[PDB]
């Protein structure tokens, strides 16, 4: 019944997905040994959306562990909640992509993608009524970029009617880790244009901004960064897992936020986000979640939504709430900020309310925003691509794996086309 197959690619994807499976197991009351230890009966009604049933009242995640380095597999297995994953789902190479999109996509990923396809087929007919897939990866590397792209292509060839979700980590020039971010990012955004039903553009710069400015966290790590993304990923699929006053699954969000098929790049956000010292001075009500969600400092992509126009915005509320208060709040943000919403879409907001709040909070909400400020994130990658590509730098690594020069020019060209489409609908 509406099962979700979860796929994890690269080191960043593996760590984010490990934190995500930890927070889902906390939400459904699953111990690190895989057995149910919750209190409510609502935690077991929709356990099958993410977990398979094993013998002995034990639930195993419907997750696939993909990397080209076995060290990430060892780190995931040896960590907390690492003993619940099926060992047959740990699919790994031995060499590593070497921060190369060509190696991850053509010459080294081709031998491993068949094993990943076999595993995801076994999970696909292991479930009753599959509705779609979730892939977590980053676009700055070679395994998240190359393997994930080819995997998305093969899955969409095999399952064209299912909902493709990617929680993709974008590269940003300010917090820059590697040198070849623009090449991998461009060659990947190429294929996420036509092969994903919805894409959640996540940037580490915005996550660091949350951890510094909003959370007042003096020393954020990658765990604190992945906790935010895990909260978002749990917040998106809440109405699939728990009852509510106004339910909205993945396909409903896709229908209500993709007016044209190429515009499915979103800006995720979460509310509330409290500091430890600042928690006592806040009254946990719906309107402050509404104002926190639409605040520019709360976004998990390094884009300012005030620079463009919101095409559609989603709001998945969790907890016991009044529908009237929620509806008047989302009326108020549209009326007060009418210069920030597109004019030929009346009621840009999609509203969903779930009865079950996340753990430790009595009410919460997840923001998903389809804005025209996404193009700012692609201007930066485009100009960084052009700077490296005008002087043909680092092409010999990509060309040595069988890739021609025309793949770069073509990918930059329809990236510019996607940018021009967002600019066209921005007006």
């Amino acid at each position: 019944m509406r099962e979700i197959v979860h796929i994890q690619a690269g080191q960043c994807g593996n760590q984010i997905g490990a934190k995500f499976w930890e927070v889902i197991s906390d939400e459904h009351g699953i111990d690190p040994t895989g057995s149910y230890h919750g209190d409510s009966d609502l935690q077991l009604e929709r356990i099958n959306v993410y977990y398979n049933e094993a013998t002995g009242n034990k639930y195993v995640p419907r997750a696939i562990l993909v990397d080209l380095e076995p060290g990430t597999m060892d780190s995931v297995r040896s960590g907390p909640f690492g003993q619940i994953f099926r060992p047959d789902n740990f699919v790994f190479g031995q060499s590593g992509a070497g921060n190369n999109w060509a190696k991850g996509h053509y010459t080294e990923g081709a031998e491993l993608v068949d094993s990943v396809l076999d595993v995801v087929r076994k999970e696909s007919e292991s479930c009753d009524c599959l509705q779609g897939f979730q892939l977590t990866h980053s676009l700055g590397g070679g395994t998240g970029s190359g393997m994930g792209t080819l995997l998305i292509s093969k899955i969409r060839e095999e399952y064209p009617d299912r909902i493709m979700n990617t929680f993709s980590v974008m590269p940003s020039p300010k917090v820059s880790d590697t040198v070849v971010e623009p090449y991998n990012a461009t060659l990947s955004v190429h294929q996420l244009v036509e092969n994903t039903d919805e894409t959640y553009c996540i940037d580490n710069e915005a996550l660091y901004d949350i951890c510094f400015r909003t959370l007042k966290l003096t020393t954020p790590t990658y765990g604190d960064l992945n906790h935010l993304v895990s909260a978002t990923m749990s917040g998106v699929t809440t109405c699939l897992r728990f009852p509510g006053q106004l339910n909205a699954d993945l396909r409903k969000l896709a229908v209500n936020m993709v007016p044209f098929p190429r515009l499915h790049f979103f800006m995720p956000g979460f509310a509330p986000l409290t500091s430890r010292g600042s928690q006592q001075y806040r009254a946990l009500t719906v309107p402050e979640l509404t104002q926190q969600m639409f605040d520019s400092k709360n976004m998990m992509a390094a884009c300012d939504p005030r620079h463009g126009r919101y095409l559609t915005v989603a709001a998945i509320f969790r907890g016991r709430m009044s529908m009237k208060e929620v509806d008047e709040q989302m009326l108020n943000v549209q009326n007060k900020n009418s210069s920030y919403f597109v004019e030929w879409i009346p009621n840009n907001v999609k509203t969903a309310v779930c009865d079950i709040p996340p753990r430790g909070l009595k009410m919460s909400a997840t923001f998903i925003g389809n804005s025209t400020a996404i193009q700012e994130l692609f201007k930066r990658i485009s100009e960084q691509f052009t700077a490296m590509f005008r002087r043909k730098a680092f092409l010999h690594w990509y060309t040595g794996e069988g890739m021609d020069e025309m793949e770069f020019t073509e990918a930059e060209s329809n990236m510019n086309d996607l940018v021009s489409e967002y600019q066209q609908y921005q007006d």
Binding site: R306, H307, S339, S420, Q423
Partner: protein, 264 residues
């Protein structure tokens, strides 16, 4: 030597660069970097370097002496002013958002002299120049000061003959939606004086809508915004008569009748 360099087919080259999305269009709220090094790029072949490195310097004394150097060279070097008019008004939009008022008053004096010279030479200011300068001018028309107010009023007055009034009506109307109350008030009285100076054909796109958005400010919480809105309504009323009602509540409406009956 001459401070300008006339680039043959330079302004139209910039225009075809900006319409085809090769340079970033002038539409923003706060100043950023990429815009200003854009101006360092297409500003370079037009005016010589010893004025370039002083019009984009952090200190304001260097700014004011550079704009003075342009001021002695305004009359003698008018063709270079016309050739890169878009870029000098473009840098005028940059010196609006800073808090220093000496640079503001010096610039707006130079603006006064500039629109005098563009008036006497019968140059028609173009569309992209207007869209890049006028909405950014419409927040220099709401300061709490008393001489910058009247002289930017003189700027928007003496601009009327080098640009059509129908297009500037929209930009002075566009400013009536921001948060600065004073500039809503003075833009409504500006709408009033443009109505009585060019008739009814000036309002865009249709008379009915424009009379509607100059009527919601009668219900404003401000007092001088409401007073200027009522003044604009009676100003268009005294010229045209009883059809202003169909072009255009329970509280604002009665105040409108009492103002037009006491004024009439």
């Amino acid at each position: 030597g001459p401070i300008y360099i006339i680039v043959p087919n330079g302004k139209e080259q910039r225009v075809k660069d900006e319409k085809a999305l090769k340079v970033l269009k002038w539409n923003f709220t706060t100043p950023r970097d990429e815009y200003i090094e854009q101006l360092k790029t297409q500003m370079s072949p037009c005016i010589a370097r010893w004025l370039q490195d002083e019009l984009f310097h952090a200190d304001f004394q260097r700014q004011i002496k550079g704009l003075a150097v342009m001021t002695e060279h305004l009359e003698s070097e008018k063709e270079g002013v016309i050739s890169c008019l878009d870029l000098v008004l473009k840098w005028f939009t940059l010196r609006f958002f800073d808090t220093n008022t000496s640079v503001l008053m010096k610039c707006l004096e130079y603006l006064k002299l500039l629109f005098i010279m563009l008036s006497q030479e019968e140059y028609h200011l173009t569309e992209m120049e207007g869209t890049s300068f006028l909405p950014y001018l419409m927040l220099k028309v709401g300061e709490p000061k008393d001489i910058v107010r009247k002289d930017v009023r003189a700027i928007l007055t003496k601009m009327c003959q080098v640009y059509p009034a129908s297009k500037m009506f929209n930009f002075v109307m566009e400013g009536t939606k921001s948060k600065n109350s004073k500039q809503r008030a003075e833009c409504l009285e500006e709408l009033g004086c443009l109505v009585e100076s060019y008739g009814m054909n000036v309002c865009q796109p249709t008379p009915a809508k424009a009379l509607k958005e100059i009527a919601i400010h009668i219900g404003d919480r401000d007092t001088t915004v409401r007073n200027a809105a009522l003044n604009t309504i009676v100003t268009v009323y005294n010229v045209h008569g009883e059809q202003v009602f169909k072009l255009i509540s329970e509280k604002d409406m009665s105040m409108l009748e009492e103002r037009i009956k006491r004024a009439g």
